[PDB]
Short mmCIF file of C-alpha atoms and ligand atoms in Angstrom, two decimals:
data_model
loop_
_atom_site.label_atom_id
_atom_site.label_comp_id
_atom_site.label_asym_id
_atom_site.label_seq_id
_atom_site.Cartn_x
_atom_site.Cartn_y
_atom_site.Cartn_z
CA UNK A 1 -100.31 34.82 -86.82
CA UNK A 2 -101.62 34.61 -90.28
CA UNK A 3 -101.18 32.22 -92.92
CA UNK A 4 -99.35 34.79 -94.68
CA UNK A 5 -96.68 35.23 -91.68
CA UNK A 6 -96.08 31.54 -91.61
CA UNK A 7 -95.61 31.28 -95.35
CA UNK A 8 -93.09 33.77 -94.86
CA UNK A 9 -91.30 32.31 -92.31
CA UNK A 10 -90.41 29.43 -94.92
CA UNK A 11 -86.80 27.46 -95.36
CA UNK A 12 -85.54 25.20 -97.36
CA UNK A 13 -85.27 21.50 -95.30
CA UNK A 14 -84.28 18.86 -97.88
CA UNK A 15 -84.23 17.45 -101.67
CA UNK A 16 -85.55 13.80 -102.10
CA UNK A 17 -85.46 11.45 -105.29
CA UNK A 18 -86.45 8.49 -103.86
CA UNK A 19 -89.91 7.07 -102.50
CA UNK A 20 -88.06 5.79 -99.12
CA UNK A 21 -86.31 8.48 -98.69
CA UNK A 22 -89.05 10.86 -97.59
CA UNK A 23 -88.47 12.82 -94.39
CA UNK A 24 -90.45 11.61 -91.72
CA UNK A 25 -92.33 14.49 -90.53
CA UNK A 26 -95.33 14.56 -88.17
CA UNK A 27 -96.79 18.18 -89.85
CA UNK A 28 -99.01 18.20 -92.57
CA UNK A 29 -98.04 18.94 -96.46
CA UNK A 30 -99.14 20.78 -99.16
CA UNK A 31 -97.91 19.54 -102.98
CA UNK A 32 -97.47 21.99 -105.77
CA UNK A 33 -97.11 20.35 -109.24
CA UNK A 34 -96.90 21.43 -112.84
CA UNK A 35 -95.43 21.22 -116.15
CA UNK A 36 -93.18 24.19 -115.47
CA UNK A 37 -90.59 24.17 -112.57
CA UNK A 38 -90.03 27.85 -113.33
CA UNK A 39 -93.87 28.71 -112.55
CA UNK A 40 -93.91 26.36 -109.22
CA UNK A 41 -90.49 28.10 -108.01
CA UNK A 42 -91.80 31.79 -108.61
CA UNK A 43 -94.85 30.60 -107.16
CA UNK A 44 -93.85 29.36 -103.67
CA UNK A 45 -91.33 32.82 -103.64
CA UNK A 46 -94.43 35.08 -104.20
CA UNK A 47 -96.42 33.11 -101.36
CA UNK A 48 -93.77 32.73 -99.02
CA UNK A 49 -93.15 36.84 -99.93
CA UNK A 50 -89.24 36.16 -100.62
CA UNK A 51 -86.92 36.67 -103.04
CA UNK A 52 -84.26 33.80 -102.92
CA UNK A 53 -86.43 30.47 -101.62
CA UNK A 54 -87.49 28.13 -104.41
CA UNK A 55 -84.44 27.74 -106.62
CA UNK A 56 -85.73 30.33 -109.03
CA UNK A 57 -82.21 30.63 -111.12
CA UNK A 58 -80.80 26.92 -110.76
CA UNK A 59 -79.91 25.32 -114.32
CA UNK A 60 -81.34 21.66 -114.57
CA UNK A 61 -78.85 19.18 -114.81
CA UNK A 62 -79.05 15.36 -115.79
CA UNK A 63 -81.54 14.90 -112.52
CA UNK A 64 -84.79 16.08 -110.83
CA UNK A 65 -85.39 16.61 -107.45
CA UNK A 66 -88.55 17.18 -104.80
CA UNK A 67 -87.56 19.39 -102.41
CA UNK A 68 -88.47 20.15 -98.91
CA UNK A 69 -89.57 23.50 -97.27
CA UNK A 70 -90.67 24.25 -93.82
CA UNK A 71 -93.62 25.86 -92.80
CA UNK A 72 -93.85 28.52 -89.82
CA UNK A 73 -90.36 28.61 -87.93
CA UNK A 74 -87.55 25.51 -89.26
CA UNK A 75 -87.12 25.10 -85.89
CA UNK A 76 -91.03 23.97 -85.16
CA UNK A 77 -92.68 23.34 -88.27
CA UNK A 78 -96.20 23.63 -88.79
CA UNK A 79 -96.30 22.54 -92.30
CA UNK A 80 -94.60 21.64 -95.55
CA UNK A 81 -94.31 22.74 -99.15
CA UNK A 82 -93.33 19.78 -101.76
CA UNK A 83 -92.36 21.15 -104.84
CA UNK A 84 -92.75 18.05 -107.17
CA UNK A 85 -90.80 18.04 -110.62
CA UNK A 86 -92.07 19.43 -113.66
CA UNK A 87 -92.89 17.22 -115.76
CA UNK A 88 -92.66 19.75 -118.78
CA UNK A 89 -94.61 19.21 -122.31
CA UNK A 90 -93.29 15.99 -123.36
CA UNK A 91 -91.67 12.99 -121.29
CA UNK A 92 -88.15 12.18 -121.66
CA UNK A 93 -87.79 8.96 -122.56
CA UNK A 94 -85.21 6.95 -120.70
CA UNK A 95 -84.50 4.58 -117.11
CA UNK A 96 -85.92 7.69 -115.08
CA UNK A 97 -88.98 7.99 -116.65
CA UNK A 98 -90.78 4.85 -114.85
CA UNK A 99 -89.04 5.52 -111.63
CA UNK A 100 -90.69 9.19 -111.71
CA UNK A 101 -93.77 7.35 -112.72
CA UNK A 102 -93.62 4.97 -109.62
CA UNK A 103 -92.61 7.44 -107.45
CA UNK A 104 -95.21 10.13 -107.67
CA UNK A 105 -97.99 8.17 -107.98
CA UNK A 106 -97.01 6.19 -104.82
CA UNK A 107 -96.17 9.66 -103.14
CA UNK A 108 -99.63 10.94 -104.54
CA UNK A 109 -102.32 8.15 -103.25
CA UNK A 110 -100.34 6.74 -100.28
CA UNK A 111 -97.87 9.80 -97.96
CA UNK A 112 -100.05 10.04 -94.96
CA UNK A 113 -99.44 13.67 -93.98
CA UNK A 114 -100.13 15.28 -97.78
CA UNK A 115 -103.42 17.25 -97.25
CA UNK A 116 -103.38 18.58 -100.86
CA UNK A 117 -101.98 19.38 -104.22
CA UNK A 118 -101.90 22.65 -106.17
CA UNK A 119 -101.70 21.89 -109.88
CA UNK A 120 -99.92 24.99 -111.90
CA UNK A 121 -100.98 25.35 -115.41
CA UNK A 122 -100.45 28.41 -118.03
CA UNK A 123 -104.11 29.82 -118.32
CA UNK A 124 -103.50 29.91 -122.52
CA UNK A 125 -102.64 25.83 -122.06
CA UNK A 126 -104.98 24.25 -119.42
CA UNK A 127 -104.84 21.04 -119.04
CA UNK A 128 -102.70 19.11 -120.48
CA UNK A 129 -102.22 15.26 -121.03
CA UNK A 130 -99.56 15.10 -118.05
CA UNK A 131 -101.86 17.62 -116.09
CA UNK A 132 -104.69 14.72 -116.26
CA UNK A 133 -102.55 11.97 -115.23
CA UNK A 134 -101.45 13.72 -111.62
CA UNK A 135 -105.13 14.40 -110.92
CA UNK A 136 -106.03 10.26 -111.83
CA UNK A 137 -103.59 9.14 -109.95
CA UNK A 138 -104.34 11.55 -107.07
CA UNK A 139 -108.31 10.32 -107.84
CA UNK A 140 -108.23 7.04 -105.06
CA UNK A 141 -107.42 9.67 -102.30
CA UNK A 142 -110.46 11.59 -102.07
CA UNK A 143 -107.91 14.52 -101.44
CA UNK A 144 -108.22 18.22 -103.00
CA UNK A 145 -106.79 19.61 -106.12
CA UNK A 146 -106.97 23.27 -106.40
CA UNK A 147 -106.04 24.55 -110.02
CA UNK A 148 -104.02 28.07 -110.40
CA UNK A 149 -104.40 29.10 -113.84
CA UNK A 150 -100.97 30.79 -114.18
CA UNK A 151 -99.32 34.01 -116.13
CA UNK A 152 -103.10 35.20 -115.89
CA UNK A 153 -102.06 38.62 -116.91
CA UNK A 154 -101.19 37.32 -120.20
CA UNK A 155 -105.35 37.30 -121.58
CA UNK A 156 -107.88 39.80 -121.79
CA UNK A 157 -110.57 39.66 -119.16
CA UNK A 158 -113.17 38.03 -121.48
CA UNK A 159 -110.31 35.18 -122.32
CA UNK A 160 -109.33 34.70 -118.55
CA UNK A 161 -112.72 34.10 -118.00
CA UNK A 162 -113.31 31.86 -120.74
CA UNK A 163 -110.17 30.11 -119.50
CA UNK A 164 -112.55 29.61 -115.59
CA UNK A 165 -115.40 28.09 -117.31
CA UNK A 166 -113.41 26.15 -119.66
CA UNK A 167 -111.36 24.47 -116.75
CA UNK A 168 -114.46 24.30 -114.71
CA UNK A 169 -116.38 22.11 -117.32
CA UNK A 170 -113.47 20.29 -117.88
CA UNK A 171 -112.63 19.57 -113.67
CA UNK A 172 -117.30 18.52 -113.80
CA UNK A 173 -116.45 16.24 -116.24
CA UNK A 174 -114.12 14.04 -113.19
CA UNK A 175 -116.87 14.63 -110.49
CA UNK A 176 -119.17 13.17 -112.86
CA UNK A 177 -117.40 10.40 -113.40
CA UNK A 178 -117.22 9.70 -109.46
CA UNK A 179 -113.79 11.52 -108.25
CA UNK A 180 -113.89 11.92 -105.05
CA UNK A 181 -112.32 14.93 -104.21
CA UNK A 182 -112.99 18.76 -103.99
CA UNK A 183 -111.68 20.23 -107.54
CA UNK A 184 -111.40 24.09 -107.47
CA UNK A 185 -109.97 27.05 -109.56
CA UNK A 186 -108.58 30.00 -109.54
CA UNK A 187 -107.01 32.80 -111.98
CA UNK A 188 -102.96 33.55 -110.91
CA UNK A 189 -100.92 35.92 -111.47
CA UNK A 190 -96.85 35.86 -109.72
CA UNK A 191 -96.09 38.98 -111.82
CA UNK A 192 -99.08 40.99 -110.98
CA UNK A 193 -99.80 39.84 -107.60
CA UNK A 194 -102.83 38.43 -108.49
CA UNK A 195 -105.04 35.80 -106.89
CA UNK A 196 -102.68 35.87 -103.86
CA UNK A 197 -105.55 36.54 -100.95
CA UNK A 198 -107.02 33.40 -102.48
CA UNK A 199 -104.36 30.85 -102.88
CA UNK A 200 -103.26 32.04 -98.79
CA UNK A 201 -106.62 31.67 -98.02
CA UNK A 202 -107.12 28.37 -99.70
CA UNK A 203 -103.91 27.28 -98.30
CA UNK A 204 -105.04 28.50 -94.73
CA UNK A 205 -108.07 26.62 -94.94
CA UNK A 206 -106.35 23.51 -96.12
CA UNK A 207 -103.43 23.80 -93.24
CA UNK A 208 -105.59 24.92 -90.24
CL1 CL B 1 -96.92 27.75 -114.22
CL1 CL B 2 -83.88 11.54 -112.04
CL1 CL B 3 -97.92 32.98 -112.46
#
């Protein structure tokens, strides 16, 4: 059935923390990225329409991970979900910091099957310096970036809106300078359910 069902349907497969160490898969995957780790894991829950799927209460440690989940039944995928790292407000310095560098920018311009990435960012805080370096390095591609302007429910109407055009003048500004890709945005809301028809449709049209 619907993009919805198959969302729903979703597993956990793997972690990964190396470039090489990427499952080979034949299916087609969508990347979520953002700052916040605890917006990307409520996120995929709300999509996927369940209640322990992302990793929603697991304490960070000393490491970060990408992980895995299936699309449609784990026995015959039809997709995957790639929750990348959050990157967070400032970058730790320290040995991991160019190997997360290398790694998702690699990932980014070069995995054959990733269709797509969905960039997470707080509607009060578009955009931020880390938030413009995933969408350069994804620029090469010619590969989609939808934006979800997150915790929507947060501003007043006028200010959500203000928060669309804002991002929207900001995303012109790339096509104008030649990026190749489709950049489009969205309000989002995991609390209030909204902007959910969209992102499944949006994901639907991306998958199928
Ligand atoms: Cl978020
Ligand atoms: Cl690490
Ligand atoms: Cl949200």
């Amino acid at each position: 059935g619907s993009m919805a069902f198959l969302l729903h349907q979703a597993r956990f497969f793997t972690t990964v923390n190396h470039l090489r160490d990427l499952p080979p898969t034949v299916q087609p995957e969508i990347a979520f990225a953002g700052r916040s780790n605890a917006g990307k894991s409520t996120a995929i829950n709300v999509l996927c329409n369940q209640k322990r799927l992302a990793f929603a209460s697991k304490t960070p440690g000393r490491t970060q991970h990408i992980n895995y989940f299936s699309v449609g039944p784990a026995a015959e995928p039809v997709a995957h979900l790639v929750d990348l790292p959050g990157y967070g407000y400032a970058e730790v310095p320290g040995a991991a910091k160019a190997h997360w560098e290398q790694l998702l920018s690699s990932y980014l311009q070069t995995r054959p099957q990733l269709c797509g990435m969905i960039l997470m960012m707080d509607a009060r805080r578009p955009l931020t310096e880390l938030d413009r370096r995933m969408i350069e390095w994804f620029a090469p591609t010619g590969k989609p970036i939808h934006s979800l302007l997150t915790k929507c429910d947060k501003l007043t109407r006028q200010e959500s809106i203000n928060a669309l055009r804002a991002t929207q003048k900001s995303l012109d500004a790339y096509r104008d300078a030649g990026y190749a890709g489709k950049l489009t945005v969205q309000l989002f809301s995991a609390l209030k359910r909204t902007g959910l028809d969209d992102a499944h449709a949006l994901i639907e049209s991306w998958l199928r």
